Every structure is written in structure tokens, then in C-alpha cells.
């Protein structure tokens, strides 16, 4: 009933800006089986540094508004960077099933934060094929959320025993993308940064 006569704001008195710029314009991004996680802490998080980058294919925020991110404080900030195809961008979401979500990068169901994905054909394609980007397509079980698997063990698909040599039914789990500029936009390379709060 008694109305407030004044509004006070008490934030900590630090002036260091958060290094979102170093996440977003790194020269080499990681593969999706070995994605890069950077901890962001003890800084002022200005989110307009993200907005002066490329027109994004996806800027989808879950559990938070994208226009209110300058008004909030966060406990633990993580930035996860990798490179995927264009038809797997929707698979970086809560409650998804496929190859990137099941075997490479799993998001939790109770996920808060943003998924920012932009086209990077200019940076990560070669005309003969860019074979430096890999994904895992063979694994015994689905991944837990935020579990990284960097194993290169030779996977057996038959009833025969397998002794580390890729022979009749023995396959390596890592398949390359082979990115080309002659591909369509669903097979072109896309750089994904996932901000987790």
C-alpha cells in the first residue's frame, strides 16, 4: 500500500569487460566431439558486443529474454564453441535426438542460456574439402548433458572381436564433414556459441 519513493541499484564496482569478443572471433573453432568450453567470470557482461557481429542464423535464448541480458547477474557463465552443419543447428536445443545431440553435444532439459549460430562458409570451407572438422557417429550409449567424449577407440559393429585394426566390421567413430563452398546451406559450416548461465 505504501508506495516506493526511490529506486536504488547496487552492483559491484568492477569495470572489466567480459571477453565475448575473443570467443566470437577466434580464428580456429573446435570440432563438435571436442568442443571448447570457456569460463566467463569476474567481469562486466555487456551483451551488445555480440550484436555487432554477423547476422545470425539462430539467436535462440531459452529461459531468458535476449533483450534483458544487460539487466541481470549470473553465477556461472560458460561459452561453448564448435562447428556443425546447417541442418543440425536446430539439434542444439533441449529435448533433441540425432547425431550431434546424442553423441557429440547434449543440452539439458532444464537449460538456461542462449544458442547463437552463424554461417561460417568463408572461414571454414575449402574447394577440395575441409577435413579438419569431425563428428562422432558411433557410440555405445547416448551422452549425458555437457559430457565431452574425445575417444578414438575402434568401434566394433559385429559379433566378431576387434583388436584396434579397422577391418571387416571395425570402424572409427569419427567421420569428417568435408566442407565445400559448392554445398548447399544445410551442409555449409556453421559456428555455434552456446552461452550457459
Amino acid at each position, epitope marked *: 500500500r505504501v508506495q516506493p519513493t526511490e529506486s536504488i541499484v547496487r552492483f559491484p564496482n568492477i569495470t572489466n569487460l567480459c571477453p565475448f569478443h575473443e570467443v566470437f572471433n577466434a*580464428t580456429t573453432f573446435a570440432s563438435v566431439y571436442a568442443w571448447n568450453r570457456k569460463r566467463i567470470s569476474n567481469c562486466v557482461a555487456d551483451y551488445s558486443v555480440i550484436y555487432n557481429f*554477423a*547476422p545470425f542464423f539462430a539467436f535462440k535464448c531459452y529461459g531468458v529474454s535476449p533483450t534483458k541480458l544487460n539487466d541481470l547477474c549470473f553465477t556461472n557463465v560458460y561459452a561453448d564453441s564448435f562447428v556443425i552443419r546447417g541442418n543440425e543447428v536446430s539439434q542444439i536445443a533441449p529435448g533433441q535426438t540425432g547425431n550431434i545431440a546424442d553423441y557429440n553435444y547434449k543440452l539439458p532439459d532444464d537449460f538456461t542460456g542462449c544458442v547463437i549460430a552463424w*554461417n561460417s*562458409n*568463408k*572461414l571454414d*570451407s*575449402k*574447394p*577440395s574439402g575441409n577435413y579438419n572438422y569431425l563428428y562422432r557417429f558411433l557410440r555405445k550409449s547416448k551422452l549425458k548433458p555437457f559430457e565431452r567424449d574425445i575417444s578414438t577407440e575402434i568401434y566394433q559393429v559385429g559379433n566378431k572381436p576387434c583388436n584396434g585394426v579397422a577391418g571387416p566390421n571395425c570402424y572409427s567413430p569419427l567421420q569428417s564433414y568435408g566442407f565445400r*563452398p*559448392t*554445398y*548447399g*546451406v544445410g551442409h*555449409q559450416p556453421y559456428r555455434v556459441v552456446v552461452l550457459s548461465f
Partner: antibody
Amino acid sequence: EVQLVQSGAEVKKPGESLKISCQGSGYSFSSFWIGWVRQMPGKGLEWMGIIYGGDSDTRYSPSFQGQVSISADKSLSTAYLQWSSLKPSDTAMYYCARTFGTYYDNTEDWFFDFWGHGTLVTVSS
Amino acid sequence: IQMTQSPSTLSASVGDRVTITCRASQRIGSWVAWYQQRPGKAPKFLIYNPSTLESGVPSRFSASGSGTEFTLTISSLQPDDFATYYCQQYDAFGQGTKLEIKR
């Protein structure tokens, strides 16, 4: 079939302005670079500059920076080469061409696989 | 980077093997691009990597290259193969090697 169609031949007075178009068809224009190559009469090919069709990222040669301007319109799937003030040493055949290479490595695959037919620009009083 | 073609004008007849050479100033990558320009026509791209043109139809043009010396070899010459040839990597074009018929 990947095709590049340029504008017609130009006869200009010195001091005038000129813009030259290059329209691409048969390919995704936003996934490739378009470069401009001049050829003086009786002379060889000279690299002038490249532009990427997606976000208009432009690299110029150091012998052509400030003399020319290279632009692109990805909605019309075209690229432009433009002078501000024309000189009589700009009498040349100008080719647009399609290329794609590594961004941070200049020594990997920066080849012009498809070429335009060329425009002829003559400047004389 | 400066690229210099070692024959300036070469003479050959119809049906021979022609080797032309392009050398760089500094060290560049594994291959260079080769172009053929008839007089009055646009340049036509011939070869960068010989593994790219490994289709069912065999290729008339072959190419070899170290870090400095590069070589384009035409195994058999048609009358349409007497033109001006250029080597290029990124922004450096070599000066042209012109093939003339020999009589």
C-alpha cells in the same frame, strides 16, 4: 552451368565516373568470392581485388587501394567495380571471375575457375 | 610474392609435349593455377590440383610443383592450344608464355 555476365563496353571522358556490373548465375552467389582482373592492351593480367558475396568482405591489392571501389548486391546476385574520377591510364579489359580459397592462408586454392567475358573501358578526351 | 614464367615465347608443332615453368620469389604452397588465353577471348582455367580432375575422362594437362618451381605440361597440342598461358596463386600473375606454331 556457372555463368558470369558483364556489362557492355564503355567509352568515357576523363574525370567521369563509372560502375561496372557482374551478374552470376548457376551457383550460390553468397558462398563464393568475385574478383576483378584488369588487362591493359598488349599486357598481362593484374589482380585488383576480391569481394565475398555474403557479407561484402572486400580485399584490395595495394596497387589499387583507393583508386577503385568494389561493391556487391547479393539480392541481385551481382558485383560492381566503380571509379570516382576516370584517368586515361584506365583503358583496359576488365574481367570478373569466381574464386574461393582459405581465409587465413593466401597460398591455398585461390584460383579463378569461372570467368566473365570481359568489358572494355576506354578513356580519352 | 612475384611469379616469373621461364619461357617467354616457345615454338612447337601439332602433336608434341610442351613443358612450361613458373617460379615464385618466396615459398608458396603445393600448387599454382594455370590459365589459357586465346587472343580476343577470356582466360580459361586449366588446372590447380590434378587430383580434382580425376574423372572418367583423362586430362590432357598435367602439373607438378615444389615450393618454388612449378610446371605445366601439355601432352598433345591441338591447334586450339596455341595461346598465352598464365600462372597465378593469390594476387601475383606471371607474365604470359605464348605458344607459336613452328614452321
